[PDB]
């Protein structure tokens, strides 16, 4: 029997700061126990200060991104070059995914950018289009390894103020872009150590009011 789905591995990670957001993904692409590529980008500048990744089955991921990019293009044509806000992108992506509710896009989608007050925004989707805004999300193969670390280190979960018995939580702070990139780099090194489908390279897209910047780092190639 023909199986229309495959699993191309990889992992992705979105974190929001006060006036920026990052979307990171490894650059490895796999099927079964083979490496297809050590550098196949997975995180894309979509226009209007929005970055997007759709991790899982890469063919579905590429189709989805391609359709959203096209959605942005037609949003400009039909609404007088108006900027597509991140909340509006999110809702549009829900309709793209839910359109294929009974033959789903086999991906976990994350978008990142700035909301309409200039604050960092991360939106996160399931394969059929349910979504939520968060400070914080990992998706893909190593999501189960990475998310709990992010719960601990971004939202300070289970951390209390020392000497308060256990009755005052560690207070929530926004993190600087330098502190976020550290958590991203450590998150991916940890995932590379323990997950066979994660490795090769890390590409981070950072979004500020000034635009989209890229950073790249080597990861272990085994």
């Amino acid at each position: 029997q023909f199986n229309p789905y495959g699993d191309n591995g990889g992992t992705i990670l979105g974190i929001a700061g006060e006036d920026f957001a990052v979307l990171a993904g490894d650059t490895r692409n796999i099927t079964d126990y083979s490496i297809n590529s050590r550098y196949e980008p997975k995180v894309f500048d979509c226009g209007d200060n929005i970055v997007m990744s759709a991790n899982g089955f890469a063919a579905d991921g590429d189709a989805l991104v391609k359709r959203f990019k096209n959605s942005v293009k037609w949003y400009h044509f039909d609404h007088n070059d108006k900027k597509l806000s991140i909340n509006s992108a999110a809702r549009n992506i829900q309709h793209l995914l839910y359109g294929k509710r009974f033959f789903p896009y086999y991906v976990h989608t994350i978008i990142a950018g700035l909301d309409e007050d200039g604050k960092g925004a991360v939106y996160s989707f399931d394969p059929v289009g349910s979504y939520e805004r968060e400070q914080c999300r990992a998706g893909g193969a190593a999501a189960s390894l990475i998310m709990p670390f992010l719960d601990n280190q971004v939202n300070f979960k289970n951390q209390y103020e020392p000497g308060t018995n256990g009755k005052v939580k560690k207070p929530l702070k926004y993190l600087s872009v330098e502190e976020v990139i550290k958590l991203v780099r450590d998150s991916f090194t940890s995932a590379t150590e323990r997950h066979i489908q994660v490795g090769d390279g890390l590409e981070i897209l950072i979004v500020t009011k000034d635009g989209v910047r890229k950073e790249f780092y080597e990861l272990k190639r085994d």
Partner: protein, 233 residues
């Protein structure tokens, strides 16, 4: 949904400093029967692109005709068809990738794995893969089937990353490709000795070599191997 009947095995390929090389053997298998011994699975498109195809041969012949018709259609009302508006490797690839994914999305795939090798207008090397699922990827080396498991490890010792491509000559790359084809003949039960090889260079253009053979094979150590364990004679 179908099942592949007459099939072609690996297509292997790599980038080198000035271009790309791609190769595939000349066999059309019918299950375990080595049915057809003169099948060309490298199909040139213009003088800048070679499409290497593995998997179902009937679907390969369909793709061959799609490409031939694409050249015909691009020439229509196009006085620059042999110049600035000639078909590029990237145009040919995106067309095939579009088709493959549409066909998988209707549960009626073209049962193939495809590598499009070539050189763009600006001299850039092009090397990208697409298969029956519409999955696409690019890398300094690419191979389908058994080639992914045995050729890639060998070809990656030569070009392990993007920075190794300018350091690699056409002589070194062709030798690695020719060696990889021998290893596949040793080890793949649905391979053949006879193969075709194509080089697309930014200076010298398209060179297409037919009727190559795997040569310089080590079999001599076989005479010393006796039994499966304790048998001495």
């Amino acid at each position: 949904t179908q099942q592949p009947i007459v099939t072609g095995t690996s297509v292997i390929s790599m980038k080198y400093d000035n271009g790309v090389i791609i190769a595939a053997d000349n066999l059309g298998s019918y299950g375990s029967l080595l049915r057809f011994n003169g099948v060309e699975r490298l199909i040139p498109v213009g003088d800048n692109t070679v499409v290497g195809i593995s998997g179902d041969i009937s679907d390969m012949q369909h793709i061959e005709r799609l490409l031939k018709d694409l050249v015909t259609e691009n020439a229509y009302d196009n006085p620059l068809a042999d110049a600035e508006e000639a078909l590029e490797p990237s145009y040919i690839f995106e067309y095939l990738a579009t088709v493959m994914y549409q066909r998988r999305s209707k549960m009626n795939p073209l049962w193939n794995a495809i590598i499009v090798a070539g050189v763009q207008s600006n001299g850039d090397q092009f090397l990208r893969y697409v298969n029956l699922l519409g999955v696409t990827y690019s890398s300094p080396t690419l191979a389908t089937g058994f080639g992914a498991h045995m050729a890639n490890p060998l070809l990656r010792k030569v070009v392990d990353r993007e920075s190794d491509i300018p350091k690699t000559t056409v002589q070194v790359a062709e030798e690695a490709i020719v060696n990889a084809m021998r290893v596949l003949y040793y080890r793949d039960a649905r391979s053949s000795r006879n193969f075709s090889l194509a080089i697309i260079d930014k200076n010298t253009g398209l060179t297409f070599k037919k009727n190559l053979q795997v040569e310089n094979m080590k079999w001599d150590f076989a005479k010393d191997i006796k039994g499966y364990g304790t048998q001495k004679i």
